[PDB]
Amino acid sequence: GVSLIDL
Amino acid sequence: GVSLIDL
Amino acid sequence: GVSLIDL
Amino acid sequence: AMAMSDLPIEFTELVDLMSLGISPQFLDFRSTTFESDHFVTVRETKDGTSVAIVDLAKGNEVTRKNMGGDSAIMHPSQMVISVRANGTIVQIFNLETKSKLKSFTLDEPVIFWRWLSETTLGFVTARSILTSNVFDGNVNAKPQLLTLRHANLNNTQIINFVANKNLDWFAVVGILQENGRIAGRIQLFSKQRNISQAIDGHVAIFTNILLEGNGSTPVQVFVTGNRNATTGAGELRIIEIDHDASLPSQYQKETTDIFFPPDATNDFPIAVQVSEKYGIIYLLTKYGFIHLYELETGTNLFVNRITAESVFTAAPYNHENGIACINKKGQVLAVEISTSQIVPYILNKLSNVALALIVATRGGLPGADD
C-alpha cells in the first residue's frame, strides 16, 4: 500500500 | 475503566 | 553464514 | 523571511541527498531512514537488486553495499546496521568487525522498527510490539514481546516507537485517513503495570526535567502533540509519569495550542524532539513549520516555516540538543536553539524576564546576568 506519511 | 494517566 | 548484506 | 541574527534558533543544512546522486524515487519514509543525525540510510533498487549509508559525522561520506534485504536502518551512534528480508528475517551487523550481533526469524513480519536507546531496538508487527537488547551477546535470541498492539492502532501506518531512558515506558504512533485529513493514534505502555492507554496524537517523546526543590533528581514527562481531524485544533500536552514520592516538587500538566494557519488545512505534527539540557521542545509539522516550546511551562517561544518542501522523517540532532529532518527534495535540515541569541530573543521579542531566567538558568546560557 502507498505510505500515508509521504502523501 | 483504569487509565495510566490523565490524557 | 547467512548474510542479508554484502559485507 | 526572517534573518538568522533575529532568530532564537540556528538553522543549518547537514546534507542534500539529491546532491549525492540519490533519486527522488527513494526519498520516502520506507526507503530513506533516519534514526539520528549520525547517518542516513537510503535503500535503492535497480534491475531487481542496495544501501547508501551517508555518514554525517564524516563529511557526508557515502558507503554503498548490495543487500538481499529490503529494509535497513543505522544505529544512532555506532557503525551497526539492521537489515530485514521478507518481514521475518532480521540480521544486525557491526560493519567494522563484520560481526553479527543478532540473527533471528520472527513468526509475524516486522512492519516498523526504530532504535529506542543506544542498546535497544524496537519492533512492531501487525499484532505485536517487541524489543531486543542488540548488544547482549545472545545472537540468536528473538526479540522479547513487550505487549500486544492496542485496537486503536488497527488499520494505521505505524510511524514511530519511543521509550524513556529506563525502558519501562513506551509509545507507538500510528496514522490513518479520517475526515479528509490524517489522524494520529498513540498507544502508551507502562511495562511496570503491563497496561496500555490509547490516546489521540501524531507525535510522542519521553524526557526529563530538573525542577527546583528536587536537587539533582529529574522528574519524567511525556510530551505529545495532536491535530484534531474533525475540528482542526492543534494541542501539545506535557504530563508527568511515575512521580517519585520522595521528591517535593511535582511537574504540573501543561497544555498549549499548536498553531495552524488558515491555509494549512491538512498539515499535522510529524515530529517532536527535546533537549533535556536546555528544556526545549522542537515540534515539526509535515508542511515544514517548526514550533519551539519551553519544557517547564509549555510556553510557545517561536514558530517559523523552515522549509516549503514536505518533511517525511526526523530524528534528534547534536547529542539530542535539537531536531533534524528530511524533506521531499532530500534536504537534511537541522534546528537547535542559538545559545547566544535565545535569551536576548526572550527578553526583547517576548518581553518576559521570568521566562528568560528559566531558560538561561537551566541551560547555563548568556543574556540574563543583568
Numbering used by the authors:
A (entry chain F), B (entry chain D), C (entry chain E): 1 to 7
D (entry chain A): -2 to 46, 48 to 368
Sentences copied from the publication:
The protein that gives the process its name, Clathrin, is a triskelion composed of three heavy chains (Clathrin Heavy Chain, Chc) that provide the structural backbone of the lattice, further stabilized and regulated by three light chains (Clathrin Light Chain, Clc). The proximal domain specifically interacts with Clcs, whereas, the N-terminal domain (NTD) of Chc, which adopts a WD40 beta-propeller structure, is pivotal for interactions with various adaptor proteins (APs). To investigate the existence of binding sites present in Clathrin NTD, we crystallized the N-terminal domain of Chc with different peptides derived from adaptor proteins containing CBMs. All our structures show that each peptide binds to three different binding pockets (Clathrin, Arrestin and W-box).
Crystal structure of Chc-NTD (displayed as a grey cartoon) bound to CBMs from Ent1 (1.75 Å, red), Ent2 (1.74 Å, yellow), Ent5 (Ent5.1 LIDL motif, 2.01 Å, green), Apl2.1 (Apl2.1 LLDLF motif, 2.75 Å, blue) and Yap1801 (1.95 Å, grey). Zoom: individual Chc-NTD boxes with Ent2 CBM-containing peptide. For the Ent1 and Ent2 complexes, a water molecule bridges the interaction between the carbonyl oxygen at the motif’s +3 position and N64. Water-mediated interactions are also observed in the W-box between the NTD backbone (L24, D25 and V309) and the peptide at position +3, for both Ent1 and Ent2. Residue K284 within the W-box establishes salt bridges with the carboxy-terminal of Ent1, Ent2 and Yap1801. For the Chc-mScarlet/Ent2-mNeonGreen pair, mutation of the Arrestin box showed a significant decrease in FRET efficiency (9.02% for WT vs. 6.7% Arr), while the W and Cla mutants did not show significant changes. Ent2’s main target site appears to be the Arrestin box as shown in our FRET in vivo experiments. Mutation of the Clathrin box showed a reduction of almost seven-fold in the binding affinity to Ent1 (KDApp WT ≅ 138 µM vs. KDApp Cla ≅ 968 µM), while Ent2 exhibits a three-fold increase in its dissociation constant (KDApp Cla ≅ 509 µM). In the competitive landscape, Ent2 demonstrates reduced efficacy in counteracting Ent1’s occupancy, corroborating what was observed in the FRET experiments. Ent2 interactions are weaker, especially in the presence of Ent1 as a competitive binding partner.
